[PDB]
Amino acid sequence: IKADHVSTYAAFVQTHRPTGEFMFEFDEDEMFYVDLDKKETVWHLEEFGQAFSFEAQGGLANIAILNNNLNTLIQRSNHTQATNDPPEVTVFPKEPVELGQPNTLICHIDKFFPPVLNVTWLCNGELVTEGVAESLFLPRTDYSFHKFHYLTFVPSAEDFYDCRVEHWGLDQPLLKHWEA
Amino acid sequence: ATPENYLFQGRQECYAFNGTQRFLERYIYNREEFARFDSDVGEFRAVTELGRPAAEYWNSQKDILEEKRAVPDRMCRHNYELGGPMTLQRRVQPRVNVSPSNLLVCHVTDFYPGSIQVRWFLNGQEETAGVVSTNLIRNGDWTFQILVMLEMTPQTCQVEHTSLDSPVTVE
Amino acid sequence: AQKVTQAQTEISVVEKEDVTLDCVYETRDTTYYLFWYKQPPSGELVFLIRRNSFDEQNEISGRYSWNFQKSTSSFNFTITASQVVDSAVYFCALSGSARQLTFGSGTQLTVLPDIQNPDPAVYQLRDSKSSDKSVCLFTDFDSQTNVSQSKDSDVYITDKCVLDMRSMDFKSNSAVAWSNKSDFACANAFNNSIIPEDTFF
Amino acid sequence: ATGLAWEWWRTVYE
Amino acid sequence: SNKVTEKGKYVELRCDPISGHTALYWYRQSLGQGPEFLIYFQGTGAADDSGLPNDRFFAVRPEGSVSTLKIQRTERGDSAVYLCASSHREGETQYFGPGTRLLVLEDLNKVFPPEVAVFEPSEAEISHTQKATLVCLATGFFPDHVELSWWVNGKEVHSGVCTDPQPLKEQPALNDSRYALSSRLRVSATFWQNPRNHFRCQVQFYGLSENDEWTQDRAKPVTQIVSAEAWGRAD
Ligand SMILES: *[C@@H]1O[C@H](CO)[C@@H](O[C@@H]2O[C@H](CO)[C@@H](O[C@@H]3O[C@H](CO)[C@@H](O)[C@H](O[C@H]4O[C@H](CO)[C@@H](O)[C@H](O)[C@@H]4O)[C@@H]3O)[C@H](O)[C@H]2NC(C)=O)[C@H](O)[C@H]1NC(C)=O
Ligand SMILES: *[C@@H]1O[C@H](CO)[C@@H](O)[C@H](O)[C@H]1NC(C)=O
Ligand SMILES: *[C@@H]1O[C@H](CO)[C@@H](O)[C@H](O)[C@H]1NC(C)=O
Numbered sequence: 001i002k003a004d005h006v007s008t009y010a011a012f013v014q015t016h017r018p019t020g021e022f023m024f025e026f027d028e029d030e031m032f033y034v035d036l037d038k039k040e041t042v043w044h045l046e047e048f049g050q051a052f053s054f055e056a057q058g059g060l061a062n063i064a065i066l067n068n069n070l071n072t073l074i075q076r077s078n079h080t081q082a083t084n085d086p087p088e089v090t091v092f093p094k095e096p097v098e099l100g101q102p103n104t105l106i107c108h109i110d111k112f113f114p115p116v117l118n119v120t121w122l123c124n125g126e127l128v129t130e131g132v133a134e135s136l137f138l139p140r141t142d143y144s145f146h147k148f149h150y151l152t153f154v155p156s157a158e159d160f161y162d163c164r165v166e167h168w169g170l171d172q173p174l175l176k177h178w179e180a
Numbered sequence: 181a182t183p184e185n186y187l188f189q190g191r192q193e194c195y196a197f198n199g200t201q202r203f204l205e206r207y208i209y210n211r212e213e214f215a216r217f218d219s220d221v222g223e224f225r226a227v228t229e230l231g232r233p234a235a236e237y238w239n240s241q242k243d244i245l246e247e248k249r250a251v252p253d254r255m256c257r258h259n260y261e262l263g264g265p266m267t268l269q270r271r272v273q274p275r276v277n278v279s280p281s282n283l284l285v286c287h288v289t290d291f292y293p294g295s296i297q298v299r300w301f302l303n304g305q306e307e308t309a310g311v312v313s314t315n316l317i318r319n320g321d322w323t324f325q326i327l328v329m330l331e332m333t334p335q336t337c338q339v340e341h342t343s344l345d346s347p348v349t350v351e
Numbered sequence: 352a353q354k355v356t357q358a359q360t361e362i363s364v365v366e367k368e369d370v371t372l373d374c375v376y377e378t379r380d381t382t383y384y385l386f387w388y389k390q391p392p393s394g395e396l397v398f399l400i401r402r403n404s405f406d407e408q409n410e411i412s413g414r415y416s417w418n419f420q421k422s423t424s425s426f427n428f429t430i431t432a433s434q435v436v437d438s439a440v441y442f443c444a445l446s447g448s449a450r451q452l453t454f455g456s457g458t459q460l461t462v463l464p465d466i467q468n469p470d471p472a473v474y475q476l477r478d479s480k481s482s483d484k485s486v487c488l489f490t491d492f493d494s495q496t497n498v499s500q501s502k503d504s505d506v507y508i509t510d511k512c513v514l515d516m517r518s519m520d521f522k523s524n525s526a527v528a529w530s531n532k533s534d535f536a537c538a539n540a541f542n543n544s545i546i547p548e549d550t551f552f
Numbered sequence: 553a554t555g556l557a558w559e560w561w562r563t564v565y566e
Numbered sequence: 567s568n569k570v571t572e573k574g575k576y577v578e579l580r581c582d583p584i585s586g587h588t589a590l591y592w593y594r595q596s597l598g599q600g601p602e603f604l605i606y607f608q609g610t611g612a613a614d615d616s617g618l619p620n621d622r623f624f625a626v627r628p629e630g631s632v633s634t635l636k637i638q639r640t641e642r643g644d645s646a647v648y649l650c651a652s653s654h655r656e657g658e659t660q661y662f663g664p665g666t667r668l669l670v671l672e673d674l675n676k677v678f679p680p681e682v683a684v685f686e687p688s689e690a691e692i693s694h695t696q697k698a699t700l701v702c703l704a705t706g707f708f709p710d711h712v713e714l715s716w717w718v719n720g721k722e723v724h725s726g727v728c729t730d731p732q733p734l735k736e737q738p739a740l741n742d743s744r745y746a747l748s749s750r751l752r753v754s755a756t757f758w759q760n761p762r763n764h765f766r767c768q769v770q771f772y773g774l775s776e777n778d779e780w781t782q783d784r785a786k787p788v789t790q791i792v793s794a795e796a797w798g799r800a801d
Contacts, residue, residue: 001202003195005268007259009558012189024556026267027294029322045322051266051554057615058558064613065561065656068588070188071610072564073209077186077230082210084182094319096277096287106319113211114185135320143189143211148320168182190561207564215564237565243657244562246405247382254381255557262556355600386659392731396601396649396662440598449615450560450656451591454600474688476701481794482683486701488750490691507746509730514699514752516726525728527701527748551690563608563656566588 010139011059013066016116020066021136022059033136034059084169085144087112091163091178099155105178107149107163115145118166122175123151124159155180186210194256201256205248207231217248224248271343272323276350278337283310284330286337286350290323293342298328301336353378355443355455364433365463365494371429372458374443383447385419385426388454391439402426404447433462435513435522464513464522469493472549475537487537489526492545498526499542506530506540567666568711568772571640572674572779579635579666583652590633591660592625593649601649607633608656619644640670669709674780676742677773677787680707684767684794687758698758700751702767702794706736710745711772718753719764726752761798768793 011022023033032043034056041056043049087109094104109117115137121128128151135148149163160179167174187210195202207215214231217224217238223245224235238244274291278284286298294316299306310331317325328337338349354377364370376385387399402419409418416429430437443455471492478485489498492511501508508528515522528540538550571577583590592604603617607627618624622644627633637644647667651660671677683705687698704712710733716723733745749767757763773787780786 005196007194009192014187015185061613064611067611068609069564234564259556451603474691476685479683512728514728
């Protein structure tokens with residue numbers, strides 16, 4: 001399709017822990033989403049919320065429609081569960097690495113389905129609970145999902161980082177090692 | 181033994197081009213798209229046997245069709261114009277750095293307009309041998325990344341961008 | 352925002368006349384749906400019409416009419432020939448972006464009867480053996496007559512109502528008065544009365 | 553106004 | 567139905583939609599004003615635009631076949647007529663059910679069943695107009711929840727029946743006064759004077775139930791049917 005820009009509303013309902021997400025992406029970049037537990041709009045960047053204001057009830061309404069469609073589709077599809085797709089993980093820094101200069105490490109998980117996964121950051125073998133940020137399960141054209149994980153860190157030659165991704169399609173938990 | 185899990189998703193796509201909005205509404209069950217509305221067609225369509233009864237009922241209701249036919253202007257066009265200054269005109273100045281890591285790397289970071297072109301220059305002479313560039317890396321932060329390699333022989337990296345009125349060089 | 356306004360509080364007409372109940376819908380939606388509901392006395396909300404936003408060609412098509420004027424943002428319900436059964440409260444509803452209904456206020460229609468031959472009288476019904484009340488009936492009076500409430504706390508008087516005995520096309524307005532005092536006589540229980548009143552004994 | 557619009561998905565025929 | 571509840575008790579309201587309807591709506595109507603939206607169900611979930619009044623109001627619809635509106639800590643202001651409409655899909659025409667009228671009372675002691683007495687028509691009316699009017703008086707009942715029906719020879723008749731719209735108070739100043747209703751049945755003079763014709767004024771009262779408490783000595787104002795009858799008298 002000839003398109004200078006693409007604006008897409010993406011939403012999924014499922015059985016496991018991510019029961020529902022309702023987002024809106026512009027050129028494969030999420031602009032806002034509704035937090036269904038909080039019933040409020042969440043803007044990806046603060047500059048978005050100052051200019052626009054999205055009605056949260058629209059997202060809750062769409063998720064309620066998709067939930068009815070899921071139950072209807074489960075019986076019509078005779079309880080068919082899709083085959084699990086192993087994810088592809090790549091870890092890269094946001095900025096060129098400079099020792100002592102704060103940087104953000106990005107763990108990109110791509111081409112996985114279903115969008116149910118356990119992801120943790122490991123710095124020198126220990127779990128990092130602070131400075132971690134996770135993106136939503138962003139959609140893909142092949143109807144798979146991809147997710148971003150972020151970790152703010154200060155580079156050091158001694159420190160080594162690992163991105164632990166657990167998925168049903170993975171035979172074993174996958175760890176992507178990154179160091180300076 | 182993957183646990184029991186059933187998924188249902190959907191896409192409401194607005195395609196903008198030459199001042200024209202084309203609306204697509206997909207109905208997907210476990211990666212299997214079974215129904216679709218196309219503003220060019222003007223009605224629903226069954227992608228597989230799974231969604232035939234659904235598309236036939238939607239096409240039988242005139243108001244369901246009329247609501248979807250008004251989407252290109254009510255939603256696709258309106259959201260395209262309202263978000264224009266924050267989406268179309270979103271400009272970020274790229275930061276360029278060159279490092280030796282013999283190959284030379286020109287790492288360009290923090291630029292939102294994805295379209296960007298990078299050229300190596302040796303003593304004022306652009307080289308095209310041994311030059312391999314990574315594909316555009318989306319950081320998921322509305323910021324992009326790209327690295328260009330260069331097979332050099334030891335004895336400047338210029339970048340052109342929409343946000344940049346004058347190309348930036350790093351020596 | 353999405354609001355429906357029916358400013359007509361009460362409409363009073365005699366039978367076989369014409370009436371037109373009005374709404375003014377006020378919504379921001381691009382696609383909306385308007386409804387009319389009928390709530391008879393002690394009755395459910397009965398469905399009457401659903402005109403979508405895109406269907407603009409108006410029709411009469413029976414005694415019930417609707418004129419959807421997108422210009423005035425109006426939707427007027429017109430009854431050609433009024434019957435006493437059409438007496439009910441009619442509601443204007445609006446749907447669209449909100450799938451639920453945005454009901455308007457109330458328009459109460461009261462189709463009065465036309466007693467061609469009025470024969471007003473105040474009869475006395477037999478006192479029940481199991482009751483101590485002497486009851487009086489003011490019946491067959493014309494629609495123009497207006498009943499009066501009780502000025503004594505011990506006497507009780509009811510408002511008027513119309514009896515439609517199907518077999519013979521006779522419709523009669525009626526009012527009931529009772530009391531437990533010996534002072535109470537069916538004569539002079541009422542206050543505002545017509546002059547040719549067949550007060551009997 | 554200053555708010556982006558949304559369109560209801562439809563329910564699959566039961 | 568009709569529900570009576572003491573202030574504070576928990577109540578739940580039931581609504582059975584039509585069969586294939588995937589869309590359920592709860593509405594509340596107060597004082598004959600415009601019905602107010604409450605909650606919108608689409609199958610097993612609630613796509614409501616949240617017209618629900620408080621945290622005390624909650625609703626469920628487990629299988630889409632029937633919804634239950636739950637009101638904890640009933641307050642007098644919660645008393646209204648709760649309507650229920652069902653739509654086949656999301657957007658179709660909504661068809662309202664009869665609804666259940668909720669009433670929250672300060673105390674259930676003010677509840678009384680009606681007294682029903684039937685009065686035989688006047689001989690003067692029969693000789694003057696050749697018609698006979700039967701007067702029925704449902705007196706001394708609270709709340710104003712009654713269903714006055716006429717039964718000619720064991721069959722309910724809605725012809726020639728003038729049931730009052732709203733009752734009247736025996737103490738018009740008191741807010742908890744006992745209501746009183748009157749309805750009329752006019753039949754042919756030959757119909758009333760047929761001694762084998764039987765007329766009955768039936769009043770169905772909707773009051774307390776077996777679950778509700780009763781401490782006083784008089785009879786429990788349970789949901790009763792008080793009626794009075796009369797046989798035809800010949801000339
Ligand atoms: C992310 O991590 C969590 C926790 O590590 C993980 O959750 C676990 O998933 C497994 C399956 O993937 C669960 O195992 C089953 O869970 C159900 C429901 O709790 C139980 O009923 C099951 O009982 C089985 O096992 C018994 C022992 O063999 C049998 O006797 C019995 O008959 C059943 O077969 C079984 O425990 C596990 O319970 C959860 N645990 C928690 C805390 O949720 C999740 O799967 C991970 N996600 C990914 C994508 O890796
Ligand atoms: C489900 O099973 C029924 C009965 O065997 C069959 O007719 C139908 O095609 C099946 N549907 C799918 C999606 O497998
Ligand atoms: C854009 O649309 C106009 C009007 O139809 C047409 O004349 C023009 O050629 C179009 N341009 C492109 C690039 O499609």
